[PDB]
Amino acid sequence: GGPIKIIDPEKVSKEPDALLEGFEWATLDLTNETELQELWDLLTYHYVEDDNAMFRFRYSQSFLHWALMSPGWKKEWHVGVRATKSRKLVASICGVPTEINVRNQKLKVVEINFLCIHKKLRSKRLTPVLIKEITRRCYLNGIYQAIYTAGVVLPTPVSSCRYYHRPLDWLKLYEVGFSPLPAGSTKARQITKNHLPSTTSTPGLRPMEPKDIDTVHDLLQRYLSRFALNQAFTREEVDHWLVHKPETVKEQVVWAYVVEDPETHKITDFFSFYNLESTVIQNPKHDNVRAAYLYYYATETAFTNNMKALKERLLMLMNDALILAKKAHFDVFNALTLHDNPLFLEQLKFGAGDGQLHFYLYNYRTAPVPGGVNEKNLPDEKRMGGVGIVML
Ligand SMILES: CCCCCCCCCCCCCC(=O)SCCNC(=O)CCNC(=O)[C@H](O)C(C)(C)COP(=O)(O)OP(=O)(O)OC[C@H]1O[C@@H](n2cnc3c(N)ncnc32)[C@H](O)[C@@H]1OP(=O)(O)O
Ligand SMILES: Cc1ncccc1COc1ccc(-c2cccc(C3CCNCC3)c2)cc1
C-alpha cells in the first residue's frame, strides 16, 4: 500500500473555486460562541437522519467544541458557506488532524466530518465543491491524505461495520419508535430482558483521572497495535479525547473508566463512551434520544492471545459500561462491529442495527480490512483485527 498521487506544493491554488451565485466561502471560528451556535443551528436541522425520517443526530455545542478543537486543530479546516445577503450559514465541512497506522505505516491525515448542506440547497452538486475546497486548504498545510466514514456507498471502501444498539431504557425507546414490541411480548417482558444489575462487577473500576493518562496511553496504543487500521494516539490526544474536564466543560461529552488492579494498583483495563443525542423528529411523548456510544477501550488480557479469556474479560467490562451508562441516564448504548466488539455484542443483548458504516481513505491505497462481520453482515470473531479507529 501507499499514497495514490504526490501533491505538488507549488501548484496548490491560493484562491478557492467559485460558488453558486449568492454564496461565499467562510472560515468558521468555533472559539466564537455565535459561530459555534451557527454551526449547531445548521446541523441540528440538516444533519444525518435515518431512512424513515424519525431521528436526526443532534450533536451538542459541547460535543462540537470537543470534536473540532482537538490537538493540532486549525480554523482553516472548519469550512462554511454563507449566503452573501443574509450572512446565513448554509453549508459546512470540517476536518481535524491525527496520525493513523495503515498496516504498520504511519500516516498524517485529516479526519473529515460534519459535511452538511441546508436542505433547500441539496441536489445542486455543492458537495464536490465543498470537498475540493477543504482538500485545497489541507494541501496548503501539507496534508494530503484523509480518513472518514459515511453511510452511503462510495468508491473503494476500506471497510464496513454494522451498527449495534443496546437498550438501556427500553420503554423510552419503544415510545419513540426506536425499539419494537415483538409480536409475542409485553412491555414487562422487554424490560425484563434488558434489565441490568444495580452495580458494576469489575474489581478496581473507577473514573479515569489525569494521573492515569500515561498508563492508559501506553495500554491503548499496545492494544490498537493489534489492528490493521488504527489511530496513533498522542499523549495530548489521550488527554483531550478521554479525560473530561468538568471545570471548563459544562455539559459532559466523554466518560472514561479505568480498572486499577486491587493487588498491583496498575491500570489493567479501561473503556470509554461518548454522549450523542438524537432528535426525535415527530413524537407526542418525547423530544430526544439520549444515546451513549462506545469509544476506545483496552485490556491487558488481550495480550495472551487466548480468545476465551479476552471474551470473558470484555463481557464483564462492557456490561459494567452498560450499567454506568444507565446510571448516567442514557436511553441506549450504541456500538459498531470494529475492535473486538463481535466478542460481546450479541451476548450482552445489543440488537443489530440497519446497514453499515463504511470507512474510507483519501489518496491512499491499501487492501480492504475486515470490519467485524461476515458475508451475512453478522458479527464474526474471525473477521476482527481490522478496524481499530472509532470516529465521531
Ligand atoms: C487531503 C484532504 C482531503 C479532504 C477531503 C477528503 C474527502 C472527504 C469526503 C467527504 C466526507 C464526508 C463525511 C461525512 O461527513 S458523512 C455525513 C454526510 N452528511 C449528511 O449525510 C448530512 C445530510 N445530508 C446532506 O447534508 C447532503 O445530502 C450531503 C452534503 C451529504 C450531500 O449533498 P447533496 O445530497 O446536495 O449532494 P450534491 O448534489 O451536493 O452532491 C452529489 C455528490 O456528492 C456525493 N455525496 C453524497 N453524500 C456524500 C457523503 N456523505 N460523502 C461524500 N460524498 C457524498 C454524491 O455521491 C454525489 O457524487 P457524484 O455523483 O458526483 O460521484
Ligand atoms: C437514533 C438515530 N439518530 C440519527 C440517525 C439514525 C438513528 C437511528 O438509530 C441509530 C442508532 C445508532 C447509530 C449509530 C450507532 C453506532 C455508531 C454510529 C456512527 C457514529 C459515528 N457517525 C456515524 C454513525 C451510529 C445509528 C443509528
Curated annotation (Swiss-Prot):
The active site lies at 392
Where does it reside? Cytoplasm
Q: Name one GO molecular function term.
A: glycylpeptide N-tetradecanoyltransferase activity
User: Reaction(s) catalyzed by this protein?
Assistant: N-terminal glycyl-[protein] + tetradecanoyl-CoA = N-tetradecanoylglycyl-[protein] + CoA + H(+)
What domain of life does the native source organism fall in? Eukaryota
Reported EC number(s) for this entry are 2.3.1.97
Pull one GO CC term from this UniProt entry: cytosol
Query: Where does this chain mainly localize?
Result: cytoplasm
For tetradecanoyl-CoA, which residues are the binding ones?
115-117, 123-127
Biological process, per Gene Ontology = protein localization to membrane
- Keywords noted in UniProt: Acyltransferase, Cytoplasm, Transferase
Q: Which family does it belong to?
A: Belongs to the NMT family.
This molecule's function is given as:
Adds a myristoyl group to the N-terminal glycine residue of certain cellular proteins.
Q: How does it assemble?
A: Monomer.
Q: What is this protein called?
A: Glycylpeptide N-tetradecanoyltransferase
Q: Which part of the complete protein is shown?
A: 101 to 492 of 492
